[PDB]
Amino acid sequence: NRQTLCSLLPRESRSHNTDAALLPCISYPAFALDDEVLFSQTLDKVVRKLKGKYGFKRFLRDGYRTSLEDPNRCYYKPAEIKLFDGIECEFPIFFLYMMIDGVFRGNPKQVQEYQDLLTPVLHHTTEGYPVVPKYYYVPADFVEYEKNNPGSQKRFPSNCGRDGKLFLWGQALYIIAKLLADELISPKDIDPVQRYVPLKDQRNVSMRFSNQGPLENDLVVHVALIAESQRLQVFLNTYGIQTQTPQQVEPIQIWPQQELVKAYLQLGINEKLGLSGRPDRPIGCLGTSKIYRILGKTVVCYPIIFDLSDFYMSQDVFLLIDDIKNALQFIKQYWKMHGRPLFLVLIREDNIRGSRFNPILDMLAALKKGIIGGVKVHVDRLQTLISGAVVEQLDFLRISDTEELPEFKSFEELEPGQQPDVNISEWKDKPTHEILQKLNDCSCLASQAILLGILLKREGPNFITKEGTVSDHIERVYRRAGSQKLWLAVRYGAAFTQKFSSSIAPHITTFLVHGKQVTLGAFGHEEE
Amino acid sequence: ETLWDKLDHYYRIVKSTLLLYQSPTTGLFPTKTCGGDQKAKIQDSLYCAAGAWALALAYRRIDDDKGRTHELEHSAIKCMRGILYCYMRQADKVQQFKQDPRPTTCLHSVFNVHTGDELLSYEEYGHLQINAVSLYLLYLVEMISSGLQIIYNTDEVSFIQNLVFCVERVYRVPDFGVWERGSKYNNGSTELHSSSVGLAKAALEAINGFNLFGNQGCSWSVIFVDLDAHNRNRQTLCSLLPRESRSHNTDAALLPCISYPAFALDDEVLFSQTLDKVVRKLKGKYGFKRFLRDGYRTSLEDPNRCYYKPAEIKLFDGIECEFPIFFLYMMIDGVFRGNPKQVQEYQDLLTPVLHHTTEGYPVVPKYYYVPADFVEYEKNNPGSQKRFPSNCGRDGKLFLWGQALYIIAKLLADELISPKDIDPVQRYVPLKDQRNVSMRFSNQGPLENDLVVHVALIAESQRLQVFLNTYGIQTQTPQQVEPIQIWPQQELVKAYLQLGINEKLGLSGRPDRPIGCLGTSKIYRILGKTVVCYPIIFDLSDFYMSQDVFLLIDDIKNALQFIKQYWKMHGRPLFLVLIREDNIRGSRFNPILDMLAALKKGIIGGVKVHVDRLQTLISGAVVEQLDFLRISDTEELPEFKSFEELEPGQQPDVNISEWKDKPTHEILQKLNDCSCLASQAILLGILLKREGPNFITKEGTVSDHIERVYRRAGSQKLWLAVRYGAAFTQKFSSSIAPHITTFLVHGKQVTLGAFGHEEEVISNPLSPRVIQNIIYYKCNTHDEREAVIQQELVIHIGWIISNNPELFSGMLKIRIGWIIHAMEYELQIRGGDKPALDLYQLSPSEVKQLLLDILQPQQNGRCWLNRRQIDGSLNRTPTGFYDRVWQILERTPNGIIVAGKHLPQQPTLSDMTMYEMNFSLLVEDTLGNIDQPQYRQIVVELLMVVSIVLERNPELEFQDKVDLDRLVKEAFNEFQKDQSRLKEIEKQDDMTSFYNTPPLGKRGTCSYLTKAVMNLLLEGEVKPNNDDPCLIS
Amino acid sequence: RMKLSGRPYRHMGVLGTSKLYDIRKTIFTFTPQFIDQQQFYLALDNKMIVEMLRTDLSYLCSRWRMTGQPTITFPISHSMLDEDGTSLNSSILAALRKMQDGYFGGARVQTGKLSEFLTTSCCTHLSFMDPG
């Protein structure tokens, strides 16, 4: 949500480059934006393009209760939106939000400028009580004159109060603004949770600002190198890295992220209201970076970067080292909680196998030096790192219906061709059992994936193979060339077995949250 | 520059010029950076630890601190767990100081930096500096709040509580102060310093309810302050607040109090009145003078003699050492109080006076002294000469307290630490935020005070609840509130006796004093039950004052008004009006029903109240959880008793004198023929003396028959007997001592003793048992009925000082014997020819209305003989009398002699300043021998006239000593002569006519006195003056 | 300030002079004791140095219980050459060739450039040597 608001921030939406609904957000009640430059970039566009004598236009090209709007038709038809340019209704409430923003942000002359603007537009009821008209519309007879010289004509109120019509939201905001302006209530009183953080105080506010402040970001993520086995800890120590096996941290339990997703599934479960619990999604790098107290035990979670996957990308160690750098950089840019983040670098014996050892040791060594990617880190023993740290106490688990506490499994010590010769096209025109013939004469795990992948289609999921169900032989060839680092096979295998990663969907949202749109599809072929 | 580089600059200065010096062992920092002195002062170490902590608060804004946050923070803990060690070794002294706070029972304030052992003894050094114990507690709260874990076990919490029990009673313990000397005179004298009481008010506001374990804390780690003792400190500070003490009208130690670290004052007008005097009278080019007439390391000071001798203090006027640190406090005050131009004005003043060490690190010289060769030139034109630093740093000498304040001020000014960061407990409350801060501000704000006290009318019996309901008041018996337990205050005093009890450190618990109206106004959770306490106003007592219902109704109004003025805690106060069946007996019913009815209406005395059922009133209220009781040693919880439903002569004929000359068994004879409970008290009270405590009486031991007659006439409302009985049985009230502290906290001094007899002066807070000797043995040896009436007036005056303080303005020494005299005279003037009523026969309440009537501003109407007798007897002085007497002494070379006393120009002009409270007491001592009270008013008027003549006419000055009696005699003799010419009155040396003459009028008293003064002044040289140089000369 | 004067001069054996040291951001490697001690006849004999090196390697293979892999820096001095100077001592060659073969001194030895050994060594950091 922070990433989406920021990507879209000077603006409101694809359609509106400014809306006056941004004023309720950027400032009372939410006080959401945490960038002073975007607040000024957003407010200045809202004031400049939306302010009026009688209020702030909700958005430019707005047809609400405009004289030119058709009352019967709910939906404006294409290009109608032009007819409402200069006729836009101006809502006096936005003057009241600007007065509340001024009291909060210490501008005693933005309260006056907008109080002065509201005293004229404010109607009064028969007993003298002020009525904030919801909108001020240009009367139909004067629409063309306003469109010609905008700001010239006189707009009639929408509710005068004596009419018996009152804008209850605006009536309430008059009380909030008038009390705040008259100092009969304090900014602190109406923002008990401190949504407005004055700049000088933008330092240690959770989920928003970090000790370093609003601008500086050199977080030191608290790395803990955890080794799958004692064998690997002793091997890693000989080569320079002190790591701790899952058992050496006995009270602390290292859990896959998925085991926290199982625990959270019990949060908000009400059977009286038919509610179920956290939706089963992945906890990510800003939630696996927290220490949790779940059912009386301290749980630290390995990041989702270390979660084993069918996709062939997992096999490249260089991608793991990069996902570790990429995760720590995300934790640096976007972790604004009180404690130092805790990244646990689970090392599996497969990660050091073969020449993956030299790349992994350099990552592990930089993690020991204190910098991997511009992200400063402090590798240390989990017990020392978890010691005075804030622990999220997950108390919703309780005992609930079952008189037993839920069963949570925790990571445990694992105690001990140049080109495919077989081209797809020339070998798929054949329907022959001969593809099953070359299958016995193909040492290429890429010719095998192409030959044993033509058959996942023409003969079927289980057409018998010499080896067994075809589905098993492609998964054997995919897995085999994944290890032998035979990447043409790993990709013919993944494709033929139609493999998709859990992360494709989570990443396609990075594109979307950032205002980008992804098209999948080849070049010269159907795009989507 | 990166933050790392910006703050590495301060880490180099902190590590070289402050943390190098921290004792490896104790943690305390040394006063002398270079040398063999082993002295670590307590205050300077606290300021040094605060300086390291301020750098840690800055390094917390950098995640890659490289260890500097842990080291700088843990250095602060080291210094603070080192002061605790020094104090914890001297916890034999913390127990002795709670019980007998005294200069020679105090925790030492200078310790061996290397070992933590006592270095200087009580004779060698004035260790009673409660600024230090109090700043230890403000800093422990401010550091534990920050995240710094200084208190480690329950025993350390019990010592911090016992340290609190000591810091609560500071108002009554006079001390040496931040400056270690006491007053400007180094006479070895302790005085109450606004600075020490102000830091104590602040430690107590901060530590009330602070888990000293911090975040890792429970209910058993909280410190509990007495809301009543804190109030007594607030009351003392505010009655000494533009000033610092009886000696100093301003001191720069007020700046550490009024603003960082304590931020104590809660009045913005007094803060400005206090700061402005400090800046105006103490600021300098090189720093702020600690106090005017200060001899610290002055060129003229004798190094060998510790104690300045009388009038030496003049030699130090203009030579005063100027401490650059005060510029740093003013810069910290500016950062806190949002003045970005007071930080600059005082930064600009400090950049020049700041020396630098060889490596470039700034050295704040402790003081800048005028060199000896230039002393006279500075005295002649102060601010002209150049003063040499005291420490240049290169010398190897650094002021570690000033080094630490540079780090705090420079970090705060550079915005590398925030005001919020170094005041985690919010000691500074910006005006706009002065609303809901406990013990300081209430929802209504800083100025508005219409508190609605939550009254709960509790009835002794169901019988009384049903009786009260028939007559209109719904009350609830103690049982009807079943879960809630109503306890006497004394049962909370028993419970609190278990707070801070450590047998390992020899600590005992809260001292056994009374909890008062701001502590019985709280709901308490003691041992799993909710306890609400009846006020101490409802506590039964031997003293006869309890019998007057009108005094109970007034004590109820007086208590609720105190609760309104001085309760600033979160909940609404809870006053429980216990009604006893004795209270409604007889015609006490009509007065009690009107109080109970007004309590039902919602207003009794201007204090709005909400009577309601206790269960509803106690429901969402904050309850103080008294978790210290636990089970402790005994496996049983303590046994606390709670209020339970009590289920069903015209004149004494026998005169003392004519019946005491007799030793006869005949006094025992009339005893059988006296129906007067006043003749019986006089007859059976002669015998408590001559025959003995148990001389057999027909009735039984005499001690039993006077206690029967006292109690009997107490009920029959026979007040002459109740007072002869109380006196003869020598009865003293628990409240005489608590009230005599109202006088003292308010800057007044009580004198007990009769008019015309031995007076005594209680100038300092005293024990009930010392106060009792003063009233029954030392002062009243002729009539003891006087001691009961004087005890009656101290109780009445004490609540009047607390709630209506200005009915006693112009009064600095409240002579209760003289005030009783004014009352006996008011009864005669009121009486007319008909004989005057005997003050002694009057009911306690009638004696309170007589007092309130005599204290009422004398208005146009009474004879000017009556106006004078009342004003003179009350010792009321026209406003500025004391300042005007200074002006008379300044322009009189040989002094004023009144009634055989003499205010000489020196040593007073040399040792004192115009508004010094010490002078007001010297003027009051000089006018002490004036026996006649109307003569005191004429002498007060001559002095007021001499001030107008001297001020209006600047040329005339007295040659010889002014004998105020001779100027008065010459004025009366002129009046005698002029009135004789009108009608030849034959009374001689009778000044009654003179006293009756109005002060100003055709031929009034003020003319005669002006004339006399002018004849004396004109008999001497008329100095040609330049303000209005003579035109004809 | 508290009159503490560093560490007494203690001879660093093979164990101490087998880690790499980070002194003022530049890596310092230290040759064993037996090489710089050329003040008695033992250093003149190249066979002795071979034997001292073998003893040091045998001690290292058994007593190294440290993170990292130990690194013995063995510089071949001019005294380690033969009489002519155009050839190296036979004993010293033989020892070096056995170390290249992986085994010498009861220990498995990996020979290679010192730059390669940074990533898998006990690169302890001497922060007390930084100025200031």
Ligand SMILES: C/C=C(\C)CC/C=C(\C)CC/C=C(\C)CC/C(C)=C/CC/C(C)=C/CC/C(C)=C/C
């Ligand atoms: C509450 C009390 C009061 C208001 C005081 C009432 C005032 C009274 C009774 C009179 C006070 C008179 C005073 C102070 C003085 C008078 C003057 C004018 C004295 C002049 C003395 C003198 C000889 C001056 C020299 C004149 C010069 C300089 C000639 C060149």
Ligand SMILES: Nc1ncnc2c1ncn2[C@@H]1O[C@H](COP(=O)(O)OP(=O)(O)O)[C@@H](O)[C@H]1O
């Ligand atoms: N397999 C994954 N790879 C990378 N990031 C993931 C993965 N699964 C979840 N996340 C991240 O975890 C967070 C929450 O998970 P999820 O609810 O699945 O996110 P989204 O709804 O954006 O797909 C997001 O930041 C998401 O990008």
Ligand SMILES: Nc1ncnc2c1ncn2[C@@H]1O[C@H](COP(=O)(O)OP(=O)(O)O)[C@@H](O)[C@H]1O
């Ligand atoms: N009899 C009493 N009447 C009123 N207040 C009392 C009485 N006894 C004690 N107090 C109050 O209880 C608190 C502490 O009691 P104590 O130690 O006697 O006070 P002090 O030393 O000021 O006389 C003070 O606020 C004091 O005024």
